[PDB]
Design a protein around this ligand. Structure first.
Ligand SMILES: N[C@@H](Cc1c[nH]c2ccccc12)C(=O)O
Ligand SMILES: OC[C@H]1O[C@@H](O)[C@H](O)[C@@H](O)[C@@H]1O
Length: 311
């Protein structure tokens, strides 16, 4: 059942700064086959694969996805699956859809029909995730996302009757917006949120924000993580949905010891609440792996995969 499929997600990592950029490598990470074994042998069971399909799909109906790009996603799905990893395939950045859900609906639903039909025979280790971090007009009216996600789920279910589908709330997948999330009566949904609080710490010096948070911010644990994860767990129990926290992480412009405190505190609380999770992210500015030296960032890796359960 879906609770077991969520438990199977377990510990995971995002292949970020890759296929969710305008093109693969634009944000600094080209995928390599060797990433999959590296990630598996470090203790992760799952790859989350951010994919920004909008850059690669026709603007006019039937909104066909570029065949070469589609073949690259095929390759990632197959290489992860054969090497024993789960893979979450999403729709990631989509500025057009967050800005104008009604105008972009047809194109988004065509994208999901293409993905769903193409991958309908994949095993249960392949998961679909309808839309990363809804924001924009979805923040103004969260019911626009409730209505749209039901339409996208219906499309997926025409070809994938029982595949696990991962759905999050608005406010960029804020757990506080679970209150406004409404889901169909479908027994194979996993609910997701992302956790980056405090943004002033995790995104200090991130230039893709407006405003850009200042650096020099340190962090130590108080009670906010526990309060947040308990709120989310009670929502999940009230609504009988399993939970996957699909992104959490702290940017490299913060001091390393603070990032390690934060990463371990979050991972510990996630696992206390039986939330599966995926770290943001493998190899870039939040990375646990440095491709330049071909070395793990051991303090951060051990905060995710501790050698003893209380470490
Ligand atoms: N310095 C590492 C990791 C890294 C830091 N910032 C990045 C931005 C994009 C991609 C990678 C990175 C590298 O160049 O690989
Ligand atoms: O979201 C846009 C930005 O996201 C960041 O994670 C990436 O590092 C940037 O390269 C990118 O421009």
């Amino acid at each position: 059942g879906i609770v077991e499929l969520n438990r199977q997600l377990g510990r995971g990592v995002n292949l970020g700064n890759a296929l969710e950029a305008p093109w693969e490598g634009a944000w600094g990470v080209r995928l390599e086959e060797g990433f999959f074994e590296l990630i598996r042998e470090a203790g992760f069971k799952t790859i989350r694969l951010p994919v920004s399909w909008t850059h690669h799909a026709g603007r006019a109906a039937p909104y066909t996805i570029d065949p070469a790009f589609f073949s690259r996603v095929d390759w990632a799905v197959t290489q992860a699956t054969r090497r024993g990893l789960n893979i979450v395939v999403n729709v990631h950045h989509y500025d057009e859809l967050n800005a104008n859900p009604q105008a972009e609906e047809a194109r988004y639903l065509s994208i999901w029909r293409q993905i769903a039909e193409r991958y309908r025979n994949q095993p249960g280790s392949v998961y679909f995730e309808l839309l990363n971090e809804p924001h924009g007009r979805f923040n103004d009216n969260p019911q626009l996302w409730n209505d749209l996600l039901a339409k996208a789920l219906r499309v997926v279910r025409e070809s994938n009757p029982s595949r696990a589908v991962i759905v999050g709330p608005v406010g960029w997948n804020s757990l506080w917006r679970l209150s406004e999330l409404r889901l169909p009566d479908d027994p194979n949904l996993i609910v997701t949120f992302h956790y980056y609080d405090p943004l002033e710490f995790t995104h200090q010096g991130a230039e893709w924000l407006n405003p850009v948070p200042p650096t020099g911010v340190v962090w130590h644990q108080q009670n906010a993580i526990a309060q947040a994860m308990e709120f989310a767990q009670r929502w999940a129990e009230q609504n009988r949905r399993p939970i996957f926290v699909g992104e959490f992480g702290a940017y490299e412009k913060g001091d390393l010891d603070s990032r390690v405190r934060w990463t371990g505190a979050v991972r510990s609380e996630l696992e206390k609440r039986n939330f599966s999770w995926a770290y943001w992210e493998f190899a870039a500015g939040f990375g646990i792996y440095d491709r330049t030296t071909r070395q793990w960032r051991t303090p951060l890796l051990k905060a995710l995969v501790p050698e003893q359960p209380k470490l």
